[PDB]
Amino acid sequence: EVKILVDRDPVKTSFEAWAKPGHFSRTIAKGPETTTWIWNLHADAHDFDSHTSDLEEISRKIFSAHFGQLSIIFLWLSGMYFH
Amino acid sequence: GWFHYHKAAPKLAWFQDVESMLNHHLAGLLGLGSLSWAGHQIHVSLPINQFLNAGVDPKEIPLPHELILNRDLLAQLYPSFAEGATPFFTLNWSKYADFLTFRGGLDPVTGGLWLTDTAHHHLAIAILFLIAGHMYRTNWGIGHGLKDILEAHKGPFTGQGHKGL
Amino acid sequence: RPLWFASKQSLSYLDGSLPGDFGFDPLGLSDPEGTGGFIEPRWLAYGEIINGRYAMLGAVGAIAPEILGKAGLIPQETALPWFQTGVIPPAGTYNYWADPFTLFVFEMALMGFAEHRRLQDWYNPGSMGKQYFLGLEKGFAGSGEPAYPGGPIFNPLGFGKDEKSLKELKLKEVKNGRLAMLAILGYFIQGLVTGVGPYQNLLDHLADPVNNNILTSLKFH
Amino acid sequence: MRDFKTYLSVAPVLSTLWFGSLAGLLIEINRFFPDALTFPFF
Amino acid sequence: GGISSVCEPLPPDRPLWFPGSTPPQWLDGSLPGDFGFDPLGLGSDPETLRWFAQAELMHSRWAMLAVAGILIPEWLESIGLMENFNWYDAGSREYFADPTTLFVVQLALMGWVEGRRWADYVNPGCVDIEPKLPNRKNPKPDVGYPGGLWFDFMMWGRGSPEPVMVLRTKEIKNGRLAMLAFVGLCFQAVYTGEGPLENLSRHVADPGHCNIFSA
Ligand code: CLA
Ligand code: CLA
Ligand code: CLA
Ligand code: CLA
């Protein structure tokens, strides 16, 4: 029962979500009406539990964020070894 | 990170396989990592640091791969290396008492822990983690179930106990 | 159908259609549920076939120069163990007509051609008969099965025209391939433990069996 | 490409590029005209 | 039947850089040298695609002129009709003027014509150089491919001997080859510490050695 359960190509790699700030939630993607929105955009950025109610997407985002953190740590270690 | 989200993303049941994750992170991450670091300390760190603490100039010290291809170069510092891995396979581990020591304290030359102590420590830690990583159940019926282990512990004060955790 | 260490999960997808199928999959790596990336069963079988073919080449190529040198066929300076031919420069290096990195670049370019073409056949079947490639593309159309393309270039003698002959030859190929990669793993382990070459290991075992074993080799060298 | 250029036009990326160019200009000016306390050109 | 002066786009089954792959949707074969090579998707925006096509054309022409002016004088020096030619040291030679004032004069003169070309790209037909003779009709040129009396005094474009698309891909391909060549020469002059033709001579002899891996 413990197998490799993996779905192929769930998210399309594109810069469309880069061009729209705050795409992850609904109350924020409508656009800024006040300056507070900007702060909100940096407050709910990594709150994956509030973006979606599905545990699968949250877990996948967690896994890839961990990978990015490991990449940053390896970059920092490379910098220390170079210096 | 790009691949495991945009191309081949794991399913929910892949993440909820906590038993296999614990087995792999206790036997393959910590245990095998400690074993590999113990191998590096035994084969590289010990002779280079012995040469350094002997006053040999660092540029004249043999390269770490030279102590791997030439077993006699490592055997001059630690004669047990002349016996190979046969003392390990015949359970004559006391023959390895020249580079695997329970000395304690600090090195008077350097002011740090003995590197032989660290090598033996990482070896023992690797063994303990590797035999501690075959505990939880998986595709084969041997092993432990975390749910059953939690549900088996319940007392009069706590009522139903750890069930549901 | 004979089964070697078959499992209840393993028999749910290994139905004997693939050549050399004995139900052996304890880890369930070819499970068709949640399949993606390189864990696809078709890709796994294709990789097994390619690895087997390469190891059938390698298990003879890593032992032929030693045998020829012992028999004194072609000069002994070219007769070296497989790790002494510049593969591992600490283990030994031979002076060819080119620098080993230059030879690596030449090999990388030639196999980049010959293998990215195969990869694009795998991605798009029959796509190498369309684009002009020196007029040879007519022989690169394939047959729809990436592991066994056939054609006048890869099957020039026309072996196995009959379906039962094709199945028998596929079984022979996968079995000899599996034996060859077992032999290549043995080559690597014997080089790591003894370090005198596989043919010298065979000669030492033949000269005396008791003194030369796996048991009396744990001292390493 | 239009979406990537829109991302390059967002506030932090554009601010980073502008302030990096300004900081580089100021640093090069301070290298070529160091220790400036007055304006002596006039 | 006559001479077609319009570029003919390549068919969708044209040869590609990576055969067996799907060409990108923004590369439909209407540009010269179109082989469907855009891994990064830099030509997705059509306006930026036009700007990048013009930039590639400009880089192609400058690179071909550059490599010609490197190789032909170097081939003359090896023959012996040039006494002390060296393209790496050519910038530090002694001329009738300082490099700075020559650079300023070159900047002004070249920024005239580069800026006339800019106005033509922004507004096609705003600047016309081909004479408007009383009954001669001047055909409308494509942006980046001008030329009546001056730039195309041969009338080799506009459908004459080889169709306009064929000659444009020929130009673009020679240009790409020249850009790669010039970058190679720039790296070789600082790596090998020698000239181009000398490096070719020591590579043709014993090519197993005298490579990138032996300086
Ligand atoms: C465009 C074609 C081109 C050609 C024909 C040459 C030709 C030559 N180069 Mg140069 N070179 C080029 C581009 C090119 N180079 C580029 C793009 C770079 C780096 C950005 C270099 C950097 C370079 C170095 C560092 C050295 C040479 C040297 C040499 C020789 C080859 C041996 C070698 O080690 O270099 C191979 C070096 C590379 C970095 C490979 C670059 C190849 C590019 C990416 C593509 C060219 C492939 C394409 C099929 C060209 C068509 C071939 C033909 C029909 C023209 C040979 C005289 C060597 C020398 O002369 O030593 C005595 C040497 O030391 N070259
Ligand atoms: C024995 C193999 C194995 C190993 C070595 C690891 C190791 C790791 N896992 Mg675990 N994991 C395993 C099996 C394994 N896992 C299995 C079977 C499952 C599913 C039940 C999980 C589920 C899992 C999750 C859900 C997460 C991790 C995470 C991590 C990382 C956290 C620890 C840390 O960063 O230390 C630093 C450790 C290292 C850098 C040392 C070297 C380890 C190398 C780089 C890793 C290669 C291991 C990989 C499993 C095998 C390659 C696959 C192949 C196709 C290339 C670490 C790289 C967390 C993470 O950080 O993810 C990015 C995380 O989110 N794991
Ligand atoms: C090259 C790798 C390889 C691969 C990809 C396959 C692939 C396949 N095998 Mg074959 N097989 C192999 C080698 C391989 N085999 C060998 C060596 C033998 C003889 C022992 C067999 C004998 C065999 C039988 C008897 C059966 C199969 C079957 C299968 C299928 C299901 C199992 C699976 O998913 O494998 C995926 C396997 C892997 C991804 C291989 C790597 C696994 C780890 C990384 C190996 C590490 C081991 C290595 C020795 C240690 C490293 C040390 C080194 C550094 C020195 C699949 C088509 C079944 C069938 O139906 O056939 C079609 C079946 O019944 N195989
Ligand atoms: C390398 C090959 C090359 C090719 C195939 C093309 C191809 C094309 N160009 Mg481009 N072009 C190039 C290089 C090239 N160009 C360079 C280096 C520049 C910068 C000066 C330009 C700038 C340019 C302009 C400004 C124009 C074109 C035009 C055209 C068309 C004319 C046909 C042609 O040029 O003749 C193909 C054959 C050759 C290029 C042979 C090479 C020439 C040799 C080396 C020297 C010439 C000989 C001799 C010295 C000249 C006569 C002497 C006389 C002055 C006394 C065609 C679509 C015209 C256009 O598109 O209008 C529709 C247009 O007017 N091109």
How close, in Å, is residue E47 to chain D by CA atoms?
A: 10
| Strand segments (E) across chain A | 6-8
Q: Dump the DSSP string for E113-159.
A: HHHHHHHHHHSTTSS--S---SSPPPPPPBTTB--SSSTTTT--STT
Give the residue whose CA is nearest to atom 27 of ligand 3. C24
Q: What is the distance between the alpha carbons of residues D38 and D27, in angstroms, rounded to a whole number?
A: 18
D31 among the known binding-site residues? Answer: yes
SS3 E64: helix
- Chains near D (3 or more Cβ pairs under 8 Å): A, E
Q: Print burial letters for C90-126: b (CB count within 10 Å at least 16), e (below 16).
A: ebeeeeeebbbebeeeeeeeeeeeeeebbebbbeebe
Q: Which residue has the tokens 């290549």?
A: C184
Final resolution, Å: 3.2
Contact yes or no, B with A (3+ CB pairs under 8 Å):
yes
> How many CB atoms are located within 10 Å of the residue A52 CB?
13
| Atom of ligand 2 lying closest to residue B27 CA | 1
Which candidate, E37, E67, E72, E73, places its Cα nearest to that of E52? E37
Distance of CA E107 to the CA centre of its chain: 20
Which candidate, B45, B64, B47, places its Cα nearest to that of B56? B47
Q: Note whether A15 and E41 are within 8 A (CB).
A: no
How close, in Å, is residue B22 to chain C by CA atoms?
A: 17
Which candidate, E183, E176, E182, E186, places its Cα nearest to that of E58? E176
Ligand 4 pocket residue status of E120, Cβ below 6 Å: no
Locate the chain C residue with the closest alpha carbon to A5: C34
Q: Dump the DSSP string for D3-42.
A: HHHHHHTSHHHHHHHHHHHHHHHHHHHHHHS-S--S-TT-
Distance in Å, CA C29 to ligand 2 centroid: 18
Which candidate, B148, B41, B36, B14, places its Cα nearest to that of C34? B14
Q: Note whether A5 and B13 are within 8 A (CB).
A: yes
- Chains near B (3 or more Cβ pairs under 8 Å): A, C
Q: Dump the DSSP string for chain C.
A: ---SSB-TTGGGT--S-STT---B-TT-TT-SSS--TT--HHHHHHHHHHHHHHHHHHHHHTTHHHHHHHHT-S-GGG---GGGTTTSTTT-----SS-HHHHHHHHHHHHHHHHHHHHHHHHSTTTTTTS-STT-GGGG---S-TT---HHHHSSS----SHHHHHHHHHHHHHHHHHHHHHHHHHHHHHHHT-S-HHHHHHHHHH-TTTSSSGGGTT--
Q: What is the distance between the alpha carbons of residues E87 and E72, in angstroms, rounded to a whole number?
A: 11
Q: What backbone phi and psi angles, to 5 degrees, belong to B144?
A: -110, 150
Q: How far is CA C221 from CA B73, B96, B138, in A?
A: 12, 18, 39
Check which CATH number belongs to the domain holding D30 and give it.
1.20.5.510
Judge whether C129 is closer than 8 Å to chain E, CB to CB: no
Q: What is the distance between the alpha carbons of residues B26 and B34, in angstroms, rounded to a whole number?
A: 11
Distance of CA E194 to the CA centre of its chain: 25
Q: What is the distance between the alpha carbons of residues E212 and E215, in angstroms, rounded to a whole number?
A: 6
Interacting residues of C47 by C-beta distance below 8 A, sequence separation 6+: C38
Tokens of B32: 């095998």
Using alpha carbons only, give the angle E201, E202, E207 rounded to the nearest 5 degrees: 110
Q: What is the distance between the alpha carbons of residues B105 and B117, in angstroms, rounded to a whole number?
A: 10
Q: What is the distance between the alpha carbons of residues E146 and E129, in angstroms, rounded to a whole number?
A: 9
Q: Which range marks the domain in which residue D26 is found?
A: 12-36
Q: Note whether A24 and A61 are within 8 A (CB).
A: no
Distance in Å, CA B29 to ligand 2 centroid: 7
Q: How far is CA B125 from CA A5, B27, B46, B85, B156, in A?
A: 32, 11, 18, 20, 37
| Atom of ligand 3 lying closest to residue C181 CA | 17
Using left for φ > 0, alpha for ψ between -120 and 50, and beta otherwise, residue C86 falls in left
Residues, chain A: 83
Q: What is the distance between the alpha carbons of residues E129 and D22, in angstroms, rounded to a whole number?
A: 41
Q: Give the 3-state DSSP-derived string for chain B, with helices as H, strands as E and coil as C.
A: CCHHHHHEEECHHHHCCHHHHHHHHHHHHHHHHHHHHHHHHHHHHHHHHHHHHCCCCHHHCCCCCHHHHCHHHHHHHCHHHHHCCHHHHCCCHHHHCCCCCCCCCCCCCCCCCCHHHHHHHHHHHHHHHHHHCCCECCCCCCCECHHHHHHCCCCCCCCCCCCCC
Q: What backbone phi and psi angles, to 5 degrees, belong to B8?
A: -135, 90
Q: What is the distance between the alpha carbons of residues A30 and A12, in angstroms, rounded to a whole number?
A: 22
Distance in Å, CA C51 to ligand 2 centroid: 26
Strand partners, C134: none
Q: Residue D2 and residue E45: Cβ atoms within 8 Å?
A: yes
The DSSP symbol for E7 reads P
Interacting residues of E56 by C-beta distance below 8 A, sequence separation 6+: E172, E175
SS3 E82: coil
Q: Which residue has the tokens 């790296």?
A: E187
Judge whether B83 is closer than 8 Å to chain C, CB to CB: yes
Q: What is the distance between the alpha carbons of residues C58 and C61, in angstroms, rounded to a whole number?
A: 5
Tell me the chain E residues in contact with residue D5 when contact means C-beta distances shorter than 8 Å: 45, 48
Q: Print burial letters for D3-40: b (CB count within 10 Å at least 16), e (below 16).
A: bbeebeeeeeeeeeeeeeeeeeeeeeeeeeeeeeeeee
Q: Which residue has the tokens 């004069």?
A: E105
Q: How far is CA A31 from CA A14, A20, A46, D4, in A?
A: 20, 9, 19, 19
Contact yes or no, C with D (3+ CB pairs under 8 Å):
no
Q: What is the distance between the alpha carbons of residues E153 and E148, in angstroms, rounded to a whole number?
A: 6
- Which contiguous run of DSSP H or E holds residue E108? helix E99-122
Judge whether E48 is closer than 8 Å to chain D, CB to CB: yes
Task: Report the relative pairing of strands B8-10 and A6-8 from DSSP bridges.
Answer: antiparallel
Q: What is the distance between the alpha carbons of residues B37 and B29, in angstroms, rounded to a whole number?
A: 12
> How many CB atoms are located within 10 Å of the residue E196 CB?
20
Q: Note whether B76 and C211 are within 8 A (CB).
A: no
Q: What is the distance between the alpha carbons of residues E93 and E9, in angstroms, rounded to a whole number?
A: 47
Tokens of C156: 């020039």
SS3 E172: helix
H helices of E2-92, in order, are: 46-79
Which candidate, C86, C38, C44, places its Cα nearest to that of C65? C86
Q: Which residue has the tokens 């306009």?
A: E164
Burial class (CB in 10 A: 0-12, 13-18, 19+), B143: middle
Q: What is the distance between the alpha carbons of residues E147 and E93, in angstroms, rounded to a whole number?
A: 35
Query: Could you tell me the sign of the dihedral formed by the alpha carbons of A76, A77, A81, B3, in that order?
Result: negative
Tokens of B120: 């033996």
- The experimental method is cryo-EM
Relative orientation angle of helices C163-193 and C198-207, to the nearest 10 degrees: 80
Distance in Å, CA E158 to ligand 2 centroid: 63
Tokens of A10: 């769930």
Q: Residue E214 and residue C99: Cβ atoms within 8 Å?
A: yes
Q: What is the distance between the alpha carbons of residues D1 and D9, in angstroms, rounded to a whole number?
A: 12
Tokens of C5: 């260490």
Q: Note whether A23 and A17 are within 8 A (CB).
A: yes
Q: What is the distance between the alpha carbons of residues E1 and E215, in angstroms, rounded to a whole number?
A: 57
Q: Which residue has the tokens 């002011």?
A: B111
| Atom of ligand 4 lying closest to residue E178 CA | 1
Q: What is the distance between the alpha carbons of residues D25 and C31, in angstroms, rounded to a whole number?
A: 60
> How many CB atoms are located within 10 Å of the residue B78 CB?
18
| Atom of ligand 2 lying closest to residue A64 CA | 62
